[PDB]
A paper describes a structure:
Here we present the crystal structures of the peptidase domains of ColH and ColT and the collagenase unit of ColG in the presence and absence of the peptidic inhibitor isoamylphosphonyl-Gly-Pro-Ala bound to the active site.
The recently determined crystal structure of ColG revealed a saddle-shaped architecture with a distinct segmentation of the N-terminal collagenase unit. The collagenase unit is capable of degrading native collagen in the absence of the accessory domains within the C-terminally located collagen recruitment unit in vitro. The comparison of the isolated peptidase domains of ColH and ColT with the crystal structure of ColG containing the full collagenase unit plus the PKD-like domain reveals that the peptidase structure is unaffected by the contiguous domains. Near the S5 site defined by the edge strand (Pro499) and ∼15 Å apart from the catalytic zinc, we could identify a structurally conserved calcium binding site. In the ColG crystal structures, this site remained unloaded because of the presence of at least 125 mm citrate in the crystallization buffer. As evidenced by the comparison of Ca2+-unloaded (ColG) and -loaded (ColH/T) crystal structures, the liganding glutamate side chain undergoes a marked rearrangement upon Ca2+ binding that allows Ca2+ coordination. The interaction areas between the inhibitor isoamylphosphonyl-GPA with the individual enzymes is largest in ColH (256 Å2) > ColT (248 Å2) > ColG (220 Å2), as calculated using the PISA server. This relation explains the need of ColG for N-terminally extended peptides to obtain full peptidolytic activity.
Author numbering: 110 to 114, 117 to 789
């Protein structure tokens, strides 16, 4: 169509002679051809002239024959043009002839020429790019056993310089693209056919052996591990085209043993399971689950059992016993504050997995990654609680690996365990309160909030979250409306920090609403919850209140702290007669109709004392809550003035607010602490 111009349209290229065209292609870059990968009338007529594409194929072959270490003879730009051809032909009827294997094979003479060149080696940028381009072309075109086995020298060269070459992006990419391209083509052709019917079947043993050597290199480092990963993955794939099935499975099994509980061993097992029907070289079925089970025992060998086996920590061998204890005692501080605010400590459902809380704490982030392999959950996080398993997965960490210590993070995630067991009825995230966007701010916001639980001072803000709140006031602070009604669509990284601010704002400045809101969720009453959220969002004064609270929180940053369990918990408390502890607590807290259970843990025993507290005439539910909190914290503080160090392990909460027939405040009250009497 066109006969005048440095970007080039198909209408112009279509008008050139094949010799003027091929020459032009040879000394431009692929991106200079407009709409190369787009299907048009112009690209239709460019490809679809079988003579012109065969002209391009021929030019490529001549480049393969003549390229040097410093000059690529336009092999990249040629390969991309052909790739565009086979790509458009796969997707667009009218260029259907390009999708035909018999036509794709017309590139093999070009490929063989490229490989016969003395410069077909890893080395300089040109030589590497040729190998890269070749692999990408094979993925869209074709290969046969001859071209595949001609890659064996490259794979040898790479292997022989693995520590120099495997880390290099360019050389690593070259080899990866070569293997990946060939496999894509072969699996494409072998798709849904008897694999013994393929030409290359049995003819690629030299290539397969090069993958073997790569996969079983053994002396891998963090930098080179992917290379041997590649080796094993593709050993399995290409080994489908070997006559000795058991020989391949045997090498995959050696990978498993050689690499045991590193990445490559998981890959090797996957290959045996998927590519070889999970049947070992000895012909017997491989115990995949035992391997996973062994992997977990390796990574999490230590078990620490608390509360008659209802709080179990499985941990890496380097996670501190001291830490383990601190986490137990943290759990109790958060639990208690949560029950105070919610007013229920009876599990909503009978028989759920969370009847036992299991925590799995890997030694490190590195080792944490294997938890996706082992337990099938994401490890792109600092931790995760899976409610239907009643299991929290996380890992020990230094300050460099995370801003959050293990205790801080657990304190947050433990609240999710509390929400599912004690607050939100039904299955986690799959009830009325999730049929619309309702609890997104709440679930995360209150978790950040309850993480700041203390023993005797209620819930306190956490310095790090206040740190986040020191960011652009300018336009950036969420309004109350935005925080309450914002979801996964409308939000950025500060969402949960403003959700915490709403939680805290309500806690400190509007407890009546916080209690109402919590009751609404507890009672499974979406109507009332929605009304509270609408009232809050519609009242501009409440937003002015809230905007101020945000500044107040920000002002508290300088002097703020990380609520963390005291060292007092870890001291040697010494003996005290049980009935004396129960009497002093019962008297001090004015409890009636008390009962106690004792529970055995790894390093100590505990007790849980339950009673009824009937006070003076009610001053209203919310003022009652305020005063009961000060009375109960006062009781905890005065008990810790006693000589027995064990009184410093106490946590307490109250539930089931009611008024009596004579208007007297009433609660169920619960204390928990260490027990040092047989
Ligand atoms: Zn969370």
């Amino acid at each position: 169509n066109l006969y005048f111009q440095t970007m080039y349209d198909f209408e112009y290229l279509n008008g050139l002679s094949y010799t003027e065209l091929t020459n032009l292609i040879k000394n431009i870059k692929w991106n200079q051809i407009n709409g190369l990968f787009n299907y048009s009338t112009g690209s239709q007529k460019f490809f679809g002239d079988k003579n012109r594409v065969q002209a391009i194929i021929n030019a490529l072959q001549e480049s393969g024959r003549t390229y040097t270490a410093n000059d690529m003879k336009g092999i990249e730009t040629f390969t991309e043009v052909l790739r565009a051809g086979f790509y458009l032909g796969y997707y667009n009827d009218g260029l259907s002839y390009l999708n035909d294997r018999n036509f794709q094979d017309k590139c093999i003479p070009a490929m063989i020429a490229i490989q016969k060149n003395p410069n077909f080696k890893l080395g300089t940028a040109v030589q590497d790019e040729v190998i890269t381009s070749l692999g990408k072309l094979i993925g869209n075109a074709s290969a046969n056993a001859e071209v595949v086995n001609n890659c064996v020298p490259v794979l040898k060269q790479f292997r022989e310089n693995l520590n120099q070459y495997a880390p290099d992006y360019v050389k690593g990419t070259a080899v990866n693209e070569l293997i990946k391209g060939i496999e894509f083509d072969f699996s494409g052709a072998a798709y849904e056919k008897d694999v013994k019917t393929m030409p290359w079947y049995g003819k690629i043993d030299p290539f397969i052996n090069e993958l073997k050597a790569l996969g079983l290199y053994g002396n891998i480092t963090s930098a080179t591990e992917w290379a041997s990963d590649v080796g094993i993955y593709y050993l399995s794939k290409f080994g489908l085209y070997s006559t000795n099935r058991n020989d391949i499975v045997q090498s995959l099994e050696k990978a498993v043993d050689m690499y045991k509980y590193g990445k490559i061993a998981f890959v090797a097992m996957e290959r045996i399971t998927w590519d070889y029907d999970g049947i070992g070289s000895n012909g017997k079925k491989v115990d995949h689950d035992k391997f996973l089970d062994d992997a977990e025992k390796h990574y999490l060998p230590k078990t620490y059992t608390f509360d008659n086996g209802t709080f179990i920590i499985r941990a890496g061998d380097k996670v501190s016993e001291e830490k383990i204890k601190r986490l137990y005692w943290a759990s109790r501080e958060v639990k208690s504050q949560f029950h105070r605010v919610v007013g229920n400590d009876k599990a909503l459902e009978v028989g759920n997995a969370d009847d036992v809380l299991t925590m799995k704490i890997f030694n490190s982030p590195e080792e944490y990654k294997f938890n996706t392999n082992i337990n099938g959950v994401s490890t792109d996080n600092g931790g995760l609680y899976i409610e239907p398993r009643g299991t929290f997965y996380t890992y020990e960490r230094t300050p460099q690996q995370s801003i959050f210590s293990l205790e801080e993070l657990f304190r947050h995630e433990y609240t999710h365990y509390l929400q599912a067991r004690y607050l939100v009825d039904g299955l986690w995230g799959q009830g009325p309160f999730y049929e619309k966007n309702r609890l997104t701010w709440f679930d995360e916001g209150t978790a950040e909030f309850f993480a700041g639980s203390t023993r005797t001072s209620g819930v306190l803000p956490r310095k790090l979250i206040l740190g986040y709140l020191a960011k652009d006031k300018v336009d950036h602070r969420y309004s109350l409306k935005k925080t309450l009604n914002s979801g996964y669509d409308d939000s950025d990284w500060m969402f949960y920090n403003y959700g915490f601010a709403v939680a805290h704002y309500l806690y400190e400045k509007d407890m009546p609403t916080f209690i109402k809101m919590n009751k609404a969720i507890l009672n499974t009453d979406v109507k009332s919850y929605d009304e509270i959220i609408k009232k809050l969002s519609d009242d501009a004064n409440k937003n002015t209140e809230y905007q101020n609270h945000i500044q107040e929180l920000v002002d508290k940053y300088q002097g703020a702290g990380i609520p963390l369990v005291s060292d007092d918990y870890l001291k040697d408390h010494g003996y005290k007669k049980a009935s004396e502890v129960y009497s002093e607590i019962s008297k001090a807290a004015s409890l009636t109709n008390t009962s106690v259970t004792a529970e055995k843990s790894q390093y100590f025993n505990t007790f849980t004392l339950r009673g009824t507290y009937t006070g003076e005439t009610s001053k209203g539910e919310f003022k009652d809550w305020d005063e009961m909190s000060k009375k109960l914290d006062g009781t905890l503080e005065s008990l810790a003035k006693n000589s027995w160090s064990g009184y410093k392990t106490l946590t307490a909460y109250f539930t089931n607010y009611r008024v009596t027939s004579d208007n007297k405040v009433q609660y169920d009250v619960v204390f928990h602490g260490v027990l040092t009497d047989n």
